[PDB]
Structures are given as C-alpha cells and as structure tokens.
C-alpha cells in the first residue's frame, strides 16, 4: 500500500542524530557528517525546547548540496508535534492580498503554539418525550437513569429551532448551545430508503447523565483570525482577511492569552520558524525582522541561504548572504562544510537503503566518484534511475554497467551546458 | 425604464451540464469545512469511539419492542417461501445499509471543534471603543466601558438620522437609463431549476428586506425626482409681491378677499 507521503528528498532524515550531550555521531538516525553544523543545530534545538528567551535567529550557510535543508528537516523531525515547526520558503510571503510584512507577522504568530484546556458540565441522554404548551417538559434517558426537566423560553425556542425528536441523543451545556450531537437511537428502518447526511444513529450513551468534559486542543497564536470577522472559523481555511488590525492583534489577543495563562486555562508553547531560501526576501522584510526579533514573544528563526557575496533584491548593494548587515548582526551563523569521498558514499548508501536498493560495492564506488565530480543530488537521483533500469533488466542488484547506462541517459548541469554548443 | 429586457437566449442543453446522479462521488466523506460549526470536539474525540453502533447490537435491536410505562405515584392460503426469503434478504440489505451509512457519517472529526471555536471567540467587539453586551455589573466588562465614549461612535442608523436634513435636498441624481430585473433566461430548463432560485429569493427577501427599510428614503430620491414646490416661485415676481402683500396684511388680523377666473388658476 502507498501512503500520501511516500519517500522524498529528505525522507531519510528521521530526526537529528545527536547524543545525550549533543555530541554529533558519524553515522546516526538519517543525518551523516557535518559534525559542527549538526552540533550547532542541536544547541539551537535545545534552546528551542527551553523556550525561555525570544528573538533568536540562526542562519545555516553553505554551498548547495551540503545539507542545510537536511539539518532543517532533522530539527523538524526531532521536534515532535508538541511544538509548532512552521517551515515556509523565502517566496511564500510575496502575496497579493497580504503585504510583505503582514505575511511575516502571520508566519510568526503561526509558530507560537497554545494548548487550550476547557472544562464544561454537560447533560447527555436519549430524548424520550418533549411536551410543550409557553412552557413544557423534557424526558431525557440513559441506561443509568431517566430524568425530567422543565423548559424555559430560550430552551424551548432552541429545541424547536433544532427540531429534536424522540430518541435523539441531545446534548445540553450551561449557557445552552444545545449541540444535537448524535442522531436517533431508535425509530430505525429509515435506511429502507435513505438517511440524512447528518444522521449517525449510534446507540444511546451509558453511565451517568451529567458529566464534566475536559477537552485539550493545541491551536496557534494566529487565532486572531478566529476573531477578526463575524464568522471567523471560515476564514481559517482559506486566504482570509488581507490583514488583521494591529490594534487587536498585538494587544487584545496577547492580553487575553496572558490572562488565560494566569488563570491556568491555557499555556503558550513557542516553536520554530524555518525560512528556507531567505535570500529572496526584500530589504523591507529584513528591516521588519530587525525589529520583529526585538518583540516580546517572537519565535526562533532558522534561515538557509546558499548565496555568497551577492546583490540584495530591491537594491544594488552587495552583502554577505545577500541580506543586510544590520540583520546579519542579530543572527547566529552556522557553516556547513562540503561532503567528502567518505561522507558522500555514506549518504548515498543511506539513500539506497531508503528504497531498499541492493547496490554492489563497485556500483557504490562509481556512483560516489560520479557525484563528487558533478553533484550530490544528481548521484542521489541516479540511485533510483539505475534501480529502475535494472528492475527492467530482470535484475536484483544494481551494478556499474547499469549505473553508467543511466549516467549516459540522463545528463547533469555541467554536461548539459557543455553540449549546449549548437545554440539552436 | 428599458422595456427590452436583454434576456439570455442561450441553448437548453447547457442550463445544467454537471448534473449527473450516477456519475458523481460522495464528497460528503471529505467535508471538513462543514464540521467546524456543527460538530463538537467531545463528539468525535470521546463519544463516537466508545459508542459506535456495533453490527451485533444493530442486529439484536431488530426484535419485538416493549410498551412504555404508565406511572401514577403520588407517594414518597399459505405464504410463499421465495417471497419471505426475498423479504428477509432485503431486510438484511437494509440493516447493512444503516450499518454502513451510520459509520460513514461519523468517520472524520472537526479540525478545531465547537468548544474550541467558542473558547477562542471573544466578545464580538474585540478592539472597538464600545464595550460588549454585559449581563450586569457583576463583572468587569460592565464597569470597564463608558457611555460617554459609547456616544462617540455613531451607527449607520444615527448617521442616516443626522444626514436626513441634507439627504432630502441633495440626493437628486437620476440614472440616465433604468433596466428591469437583470436578465431572464429563455430555455427548456430542468423543472428543478426555477423552484430553487425562487426559494432562495424568497428567503433573502424575508431575511434582509426588512433590514433595508431605512435606505428606502434614499432609494426614493435616487429613483424619482419632483419639482421643489418653489421652482418657479423663486422667480415669479407677481407671486413674490402677492406673498409680500399677504404677509404685510396678515399682521393686521383682518379678512382678505382674492379673485380668480380659471378653475386651473384656482387649482
């Protein structure tokens, strides 16, 4: 059976391969080599799990194919679903309905988790009879007890607007919303022809009628969208408002979350914001981050740029990493070193093990020698390519000849630029 | 008012090209948006997993029922085997259908939940200078807002009230051409098309039209216009001298006679 998330580029990264003392192992769970960069990743991951401070930023820099996104995915996988890890690209902010600043604001607020716990007394039971004359009575039922309730004006109005019939397992809370939870217990045989799209006959509840329902759910600090309109939950599934007013975003929601945390009804859990390829950001977003990192409850940023001394978009000034120095000053730069003949073959072997490709030692050697001359991801793709070419060859073990067949079939950037002599 | 309503004369087979009863999938099992405002977190997370109707109990319940109690305490030819077998088999199919549908109508849980949405939702006025509805002075939200500040904001009703003095005299723009209802449709349509649109329009008219009563005043002025009742009197020197004489004479308090010789002039 095939799942939605089959093996991809970084599927082999099943967490960050460190020790109890953050010491990087040579061969570990997915990650390989890059000892210093991986130890720095573990340090920032511990700083994350701590969450005592805000406004931290680490920038992983290195040549393309050194494992920046690999370390990012390792940190993401090591940071369980408990805390949010919002991984956005460097171009997911250039929106048409949102400005280049509200996008970063929403991304920040999305990386701050909040575990809400709610308690409520609930009445649940099968409705036996509803008499009405206005005032009336209601006979709820459960295998443990059967009761009587006198209904008031609002109760009767809600009951009539919900059209609850006999046998329906009604559910009533204080400050009655009157959730018609389940369908009918009895009065079956409607399946003879049809059932309502909302009918879920499942049997009548057991146990006591009244109960205390404690419900815990993890939301994000972006819940301002859940207030920014009349029907708010709807705007949470699509683009939504162009931008929620600051006069509410930055004061009202924050104060209410503080009150919740003081009363003990909720608790904030900061997360991580991984902005990949941040070199595309304009100087405006960088000047915004300059102050955003100064705020009180900002998440920790993880940037991954592969550009050296290059021009900053929107301007003509060259700078390291292609971003402003006033922003680089507030970061913490880690460096990833290029892989060697020893590490390239190791990660290639791990990638072969991923899809369970049995490769010979000569094939491993030749593929490593190829990838050390052209590119790493090129040799990674050659793994699956040769695997398929040999599976069609009625083979079981990929060999040097099948690897060279693919090497000749599929070109790389270098050989393609070389063969581009015709100039159409 | 253009009598020639440009009704669309499109073809008939195209009125509904997507309707196909036996060629569509049950998207209901993927409807997450519809759960947020109808289904509760406690419903899907705690109740269903334990109270899911089992096929055993479903088969068992199909038996002889019992009558309800009667409380009054005031103290402390022969049949066909083929036919009966077909009846039994169709009944079994019915029971399997209920087992399937009841289990399929509760497979997916909400993304947030009713209680989660109710907890996240604050008083409808979030950052407005006017306070929300307060049940009474028993909590802060009543004593934390001022009526002097509440008066500082004018609703559209108060805006219309205060602009009514100029709305009566400054709204005069008549549109150059008026069109009847947007466009009819000449068609051989499926009979079930017009009833739904009619019901939708009736619902909208019953819901919103009562709320549009205030804008009727502006609609009248923007739909029709009439003379100011002084249009020519502003320039009629004869009528102006007549009014001057009348106003100078009414201060004395004596009877006055006027003579005219034309029914229309009298009018």
């Amino acid at each position: 059976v095939t799942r939605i998330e089959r093996i991809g580029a970084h599927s082999h990264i099943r967490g960050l391969g460190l020790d109890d003392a953050l010491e990087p192992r040579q061969a570990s769970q997915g990650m390989v080599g890059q000892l210093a960069a991986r130890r720095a990743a573990g340090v920032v991951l511990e700083m994350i799990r701590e969450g005592k401070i805000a406004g931290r930023a680490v920038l992983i820099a290195g040549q393309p194919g050194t494992g920046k996104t690999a370390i990012a995915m390792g940190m993401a996988q090591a940071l369980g679903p408990d805390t949010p890890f919002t991984a956005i690209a460097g171009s997911e902010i250039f929106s048409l309905e949102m400005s280049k600043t509200e996008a970063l604001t929403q991304a920040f607020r999305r990386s701050i988790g909040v575990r809400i716990k709610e308690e409520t007394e609930i009445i649940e039971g099968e409705v036996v009879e509803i008499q009405i004359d206005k005032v009336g009575k209601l006979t709820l039922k459960t295998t443990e007890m059967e009761t009587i309730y006198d209904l008031g004006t609002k109760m009767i109005e809600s009951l009539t607007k919900d059209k609850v019939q006999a046998g329906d397992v009604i559910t009533i809370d204080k400050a009655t919303g009157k959730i018609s939870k389940l369908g009918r217990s009895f009065t079956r045989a409607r399946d003879y022809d049809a059932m309502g799209s909302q009918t879920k006959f499942v049997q009548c509840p057991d146990g006591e009628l009244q109960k205390r329902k404690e419900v815990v759910h993890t939301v994000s600090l972006h819940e301002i969208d859940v207030i920014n309109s009349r029907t708010q939950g709807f705007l949470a599934l699509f683009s939504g408002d162009t931008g929620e007013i600051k006069s509410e975003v930055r004061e009202q929601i924050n104060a209410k979350v503080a009150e919740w945390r003081e009363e003990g009804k909720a608790e904030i859990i900061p997360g991580v914001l991984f902005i990949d390829e941040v070199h595309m950001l304009d100087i405006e977003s960088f000047s915004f981050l300059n102050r955003a990192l100064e705020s009180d409850m900002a998440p920790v940023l993880i940037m991954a740029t592969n550009r050296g001394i290059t021009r900053i978009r929107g301007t003509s000034y060259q700078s390291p990493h292609g971003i402003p120095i006033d922003l680089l000053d507030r970061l913490l730069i880690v460096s990833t070193t290029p892989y060697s003949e020893k590490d390239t073959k190791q990660i290639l072997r791990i990638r072969c093990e991923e899809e369970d490709v049995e490769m010979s030692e000569d094939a491993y050697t030749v593929l490593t020698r190829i990838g050390l001359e052209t590119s790493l991801r090129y040799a990674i793709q050659l793994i699956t390519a040769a695997s398929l070419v040999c599976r069609k060859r009625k083979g079981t073990e990929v060999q040097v000849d099948d690897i060279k067949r693919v090497y000749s079939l599929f070109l790389d950037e270098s050989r393609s630029t070389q063969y581009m002599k015709e100039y159409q | 008012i253009t009598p020639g309503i440009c009704f669309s004369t499109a073809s008939l087979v195209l009125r509904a090209t997507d309707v196909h009863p036996l060629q569509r999938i049950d998207m209901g099992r993927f409807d997450l948006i519809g759960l947020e405002g109808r289904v509760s977190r406690y419903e899907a997370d705690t109740f269903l997993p334990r109270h899911r109707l089992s096929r055993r109990v479903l088969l068992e319940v199909a038996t002889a029922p019992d009558p309800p109690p009667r409380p009054k305490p005031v103290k402390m030819p022969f049949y066909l085997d083929s036919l009966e077998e077909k009846r039994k088999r169709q009944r079994s199919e019915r029971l399997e259908r209920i087992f399937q549908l009841s289990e399929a109508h509760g497979a997916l849980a909400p993304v947030y939940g009713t209680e989660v949405l109710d907890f996240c939702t604050l008083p409808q006025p979030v950052a407005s200078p006017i306070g929300p509805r307060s049940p009474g002075p028993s909590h802060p939200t009543f004593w934390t807002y001022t009526e002097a500040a509440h008066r500082a904001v004018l609703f559209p009703q108060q805006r219309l009230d205060q602009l009514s003095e100029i709305i009566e005299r400054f709204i005069f723009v008549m549109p150059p051409v008026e069109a009847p209802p947007p466009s009819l449709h000449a068609c051989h349509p499926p009979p079930w098309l017009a009833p739904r649109q009619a019901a939708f329009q009736e619902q909208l008219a019953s819901e919103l039209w009562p709320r549009a009563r205030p804008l009727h005043r502006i609609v009248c002025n923007m739909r029709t216009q009439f003379p100011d009742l002084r249009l020519i009197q502003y320039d009629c020197g004869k009528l102006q001298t007549l009014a001057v004489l009348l106003r100078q004479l009414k201060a004395e308090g004596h009877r006055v006679l006027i003579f005219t010789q034309m029914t229309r002039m009298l009018d």
Partner: peptide
C-alpha cells in the same frame, strides 16, 4: 445514579401489587 433504579424496583413492585 442507581437511586433511580432502586426507586424503579419499588414502584414496579407497588404497581404489580395494585
């Protein structure tokens, strides 16, 4: 909770007797 059933038994006995 079980007070309901304890009372139901007594009332059913009373009904069966009368």
């Amino acid at each position: 909770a079980r007070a309901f059933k304890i009372i139901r038994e007594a009332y059913k006995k009373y009904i069966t007797a009368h």
